[PDB]
Amino acid sequence: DVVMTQTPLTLSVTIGQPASISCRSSQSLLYINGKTHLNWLLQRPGQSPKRLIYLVSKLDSGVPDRFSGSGSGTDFTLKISRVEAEDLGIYFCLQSTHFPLTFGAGTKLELKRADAAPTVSIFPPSSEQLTSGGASVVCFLNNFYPRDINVKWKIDGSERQNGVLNSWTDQDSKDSTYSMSSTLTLTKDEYERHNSYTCEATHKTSTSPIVKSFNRNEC
Amino acid sequence: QVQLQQSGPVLVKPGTSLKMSCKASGYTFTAYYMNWMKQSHGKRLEWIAVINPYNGFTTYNQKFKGKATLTVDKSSNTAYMDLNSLTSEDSAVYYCVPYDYAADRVYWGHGTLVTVSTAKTTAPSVYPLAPVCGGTTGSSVTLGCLVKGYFPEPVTLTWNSGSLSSGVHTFPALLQSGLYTLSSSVTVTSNTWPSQTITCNVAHPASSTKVDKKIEPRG
Ligand SMILES: CN(CCCCC(=O)O)c1ccc(/C=C/c2ccc([N+](=O)[O-])cc2)cc1
User: Fold this and answer.
1) Coil, strand, or helix at residue A131?
2) Pairing label, strands A164-168, A119-123
3) Per the CB < 8 Å rule, is A181 touching B43?
4) Domain ranges of chain A
5) Residue B35 beta carbon below 6 angstroms from any ligand 1 atom
6) Which CATH class name applies to A114-219?
7) For chain A, what is the radius of gyration of the CA atoms?
8) CATH code of the domain occupying A1-113
């Protein structure tokens, strides 16, 4: 089998700046007619893959010219002249010269933008969940950057680590930010035992936290 | 226009067989070879086999030979893939990928998500999340929706039947104790809500669940 080795696995770039992805194969991909069946694909968040380049350097329909591909022997390179929002996702090289068809591991193309503080919203449990006998406090840390960020939860002034789960979205096409959701799972009894609920977003010690709170008790 | 429609997501027990379909339109069905691909954990890609629908002749990747069987029904323009001897290792997204050799164009389906497990299907509870009781007249308002305790994947969450698309963050689901939990936030202008009804729409195919939670001001 042909092995496609991609580099790097993840590449972080500023808008407008060039990008260079490499894919190297374990054998020649020259076909019996002398054409080289090297394909490049982009898979954008939530979508299925789409081929961008075929035959080393030929672009698929209505693929912008910022994209180009070059190949010398067993080494093959995708280049983006200037990276734009739309470019974000996972890039795969694909040989279709020899069977089976084989893929590189994929390269994650990330955007570098200016640091940005989260928009924090805290949400008490809904009255339906309380009727159900459960209780979850949800916090959204929205449109921040970089991806690295921490959530502190405090109940009646004590830090709480148990029963917290965090989910990150993929990088946002529109503005290059990340968003994150933190869920604090409790029992009804426990939620009813306490009153002050606090969600904090910090990236580093030396940056003021963004804090959002409520009191179960008052409206 | 070339269109592929793949069978919906499934949860199947280990040791069984599964037949997936891929109904094609917008081109002469027999003119394009039909490839099948597997993607594992939303990254790693493998090519399974290809069929030539004209004569039904298939070529397999040795890794999957005996595991996968490709067929077509010319009459219905539909391609099929059978997977037998299922294990959790087979949990993946499966793509049909027709390749037009005359023109050299390739297209990808939206895939079919397979979950191999003995876990039983559990319908999610859906809870609307309204902002805190308090009177922060911020420029914007964020609402949320919590979808908890379901199995298997996937779930479709939309706001106002998908007509509300800007300012949405739907978070990847997380698994704890055999059940998935997911959240989505929506941010609109202060003018919009509460004066316009906003509804969380959640579908969980496997359980035939379809619920509309209206987000409403609390307490
Ligand atoms: C049957 N066959 C070899 C035929 C060679 C001669 C001929 O075309 O008549 C063949 C060729 C190519 C394929 C698939 C090519 C392919 C699939 C997928 C992608 N892609 O980018 O996803 C690119 C290219 C499948 C079978």
Assistant:
1) helix
2) unpaired
3) no
4) 1-113, 114-219
5) yes
6) mainly beta
7) 24
8) 2.60.40.10
